[PDB]
């Protein structure tokens, strides 16, 4: 009977494959074959933030596109004011193995988690004026790879136990559990409307969930190795994934298929970070060869290089207004490019 | 004016945070974190001395942080990269399915990893008494066919002197690890193998000496002497 179920699943996968093949009629490159190229744009290191001791695993921009938060393996969480290159709120962490950090949309809270299998929520503004652990969430049996604030009262986390969880910060309990990933989830990205979110895991698959009840609407399988980073298109109808097979891919919703892959022959290092520009024309991908490649998302031709680091980048982000891009690195340096 | 006022307030807050941060840097520099890794749960990592476990111990007024992985899945492909900056990886192997082959494969994967290529390994061979009991009693020979051709090295220095067969087996296992260590990498990181009987307190001294040698080699590499 197990063999019968395996045959049933294989037949269903084949049927989905034929449905996708019938859906595809013309590649995205053919559509954007007459589009004027970007023009080989170059961006210099506008600023360098150098307050961390150990490698920087994650950083997240604020809503105002002025304040950012960075987490480093020296157990440090620093909120930089990028305009005046100043720093505020150097938050010490209970566990020094933080691997992710998030900034609340309202700007009132900061999340961080790591090898402790726990997500700590810190209240930025207090009557005492000192940042303290507002709440500790521990419903994960594996390391927290990513976390994102939903509405300043709910948080979505992905862990190394192959599960995602939507929490309630007030009650400190798991509200919803998203399951279906084989490999541990490495990254997640919220939709602009906060109605859906995509998650990329250690398997080649990426799954799209809806936070209201979380039943894994769609699954995309185009990569060949672990999906390290995921980012969501500004219009909300597409997303981009970066994997360890040294390729980036652009999937789209409501078509359940690949659109275009970004890769080069002389690239043999995996992707660690992926982000989109304000209009979505540019796709910024961080690499393991200490460089950041800026791709024309419509033509899959390299448009820029951002080689300002000494070690792997491991994190990058673009401001809400698209003014500047911040890249962290394992050399304990943050760089703001514009 | 508001703008100079808030700029001054932000600058003084930055100065205070800078003071606290240099104070924290002083503590962080003199710590020498280590990663205590074991092939399986059978290995007696605990007596060597959720999510992650911390152990603080001082040797000759030198602080040491040992991190033991707890509530994590068996797939260590991703989170092991968090330990590329540790001073050493204390790899504990029970020298008593073929668990030895699994330990060898794990050691090879750790040694040949791209991000751990600069991290040194302190190899501990536990279950020495168990290995002696198994060797004297009438599974090592069949698991490793090359053991028959193996001969005890000249610098065996068998201090316990329990048998000329136990020493041969333990040195065969040590050479099995050293083959990978020497072949895969040269001039970047070093492997320090030791025999432990799990009833001795000298393990922390051996770890201290190996860490001293590791940092000496790292400093020597700055001048390209090594």
């Amino acid at each position, epitope marked *: 009977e197990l063999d019968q179920l395996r045959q049933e699943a294989e037949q269903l996968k084949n049927q989905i494959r034929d449905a996708r093949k019938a859906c595809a009629d013309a590649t995205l490159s053919q559509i954007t074959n007459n589009i004027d190229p970007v023009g080989r744009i170059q961006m210099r290191t506008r600023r360098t933030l150098r307050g961390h001791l150990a490698k920087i695993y994650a950083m997240h921009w604020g809503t105002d596109s002025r304040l950012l938060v960075s987490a480093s393996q020296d157990g440090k969480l620093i909120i930089w004011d990028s305009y005046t290159t100043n720093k505020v709120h150097a938050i010490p962490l209970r566990s020094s193995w933080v691997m992710t950090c998030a900034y609340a949309p309202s700007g009132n809270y900061v999340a961080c988690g790591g090898l402790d299998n726990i997500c700590s929520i810190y209240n930025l503004k207090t009557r005492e004026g000192n940042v303290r652990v507002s709440r500790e969430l521990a419903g994960h049996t594996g390391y927290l790879s990513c976390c994102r604030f939903l509405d300043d009262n709910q948080i979505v986390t992905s862990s190394g136990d192959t599960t995602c969880a939507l929490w309630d910060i007030e009650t400190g309990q798991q509200t919803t559990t998203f399951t279906g990933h084989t490999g541990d989830v490495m990254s997640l990205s919220l939709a602009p409307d906060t109605r859906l979110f995509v998650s990329g895991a250690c398997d080649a698959s990426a799954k799209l969930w809806d936070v209201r009840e979380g039943m894994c609407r769609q699954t995309f399988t185009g990569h060949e190795s672990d999906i390290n980073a995921i980012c969501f298109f500004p219009n909300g109808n597409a997303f981009a994934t970066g994997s*360890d097979d040294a390729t980036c891919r652009l999937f789209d919703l409501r078509a359940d298929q690949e659109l275009m892959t970004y890769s080069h022959d002389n690239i043999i290092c995996g992707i660690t970070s992926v982000s989109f520009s304000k209009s979505g024309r540019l796709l910024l991908a961080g690499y393991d060869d200490f460089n950041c490649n800026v791709w024309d998302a419509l033509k899959a031709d390299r448009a820029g290089v951002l080689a300002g680091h000494d070690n792997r980048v491991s994190c990058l982000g673009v401001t809400d207004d698209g003014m500047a891009v911040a890249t962290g690195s394992w050399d304990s340096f943050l760089k703001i490019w514009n | 004016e508001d703008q100079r006022n808030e700029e001054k307030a932000q600058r003084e807050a930055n100065k205070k945070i800078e003071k606290q941060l240099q104070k924290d840097k002083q503590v962080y520099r003199a710590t020498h974190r280590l990663l205590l890794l074991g092939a399986g749960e059978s290995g007696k990592n605990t007596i060597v001395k959720s999510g992650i476990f911390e152990t603080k111990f001082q040797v000759d007024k030198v602080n040491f942080h040992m991190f033991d992985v707890g509530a994590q*899945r068996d797939e260590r492909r991703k989170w092991i990269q968090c330990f590329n900056d540790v001073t050493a990886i204390i790899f504990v192997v029970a020298s008593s399915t073929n668990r030895l082959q699994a330990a060898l494969k794990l050691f090879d994967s750790i040694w040949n990893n791209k991000w751990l290529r600069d991290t040194s390994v302190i190899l501990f061979l536990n279950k020495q008494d168990l290995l002696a009991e198994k060797v004297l009693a009438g599974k090592i020979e069949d698991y490793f*066919p090359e053991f028959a051709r193996y001969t005890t090295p000249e610098d065996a220095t068998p201090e316990p002197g329990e048998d000329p067969r136990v020493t041969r087996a333990k040195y065969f296992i040590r050479d099995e690890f050293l083959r990978i260590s020497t072949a895969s990498g040269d001039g970047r990181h070093y492997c320090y193998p030791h025999f432990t009987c799990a009833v001795d307190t000298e393990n922390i001294r051996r770890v201290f000496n190996d860490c001293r040698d590791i940092i000496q080699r790292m400093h020597l590499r700055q001048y390209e002497l090594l």
Partner: nanobody
Amino acid sequence: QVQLQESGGGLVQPGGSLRLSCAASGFTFSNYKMNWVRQAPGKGLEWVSDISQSGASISYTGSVKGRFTISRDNAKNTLYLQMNSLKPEDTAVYYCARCPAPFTRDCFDVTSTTYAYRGQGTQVTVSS
């Protein structure tokens, strides 16, 4: 998607010969190092052998060193394991595993349970 399908191997008399063929799809075969692992009844996954890209770095576990041989055809996108002298204690489910990262001399967690880039496996039983 990454799909590894193993074929061959049934009931074989002790001392007999067998051939296991692993067909791979969804990735560039030549970029990855391949592995053969096995799981005995009630024993857990154990590593049997591995071969690097384009061969030339073959290695086996000690138990099967003199008997089993592993080869690969990059053009045919296939992995082969020949078992020329079977013994009763190697009755197991055999899996074709593809290591997680391309262009890597190291590769992790093939023997770990719930591993993504592993096939369904074939039963190989040796008995009278």
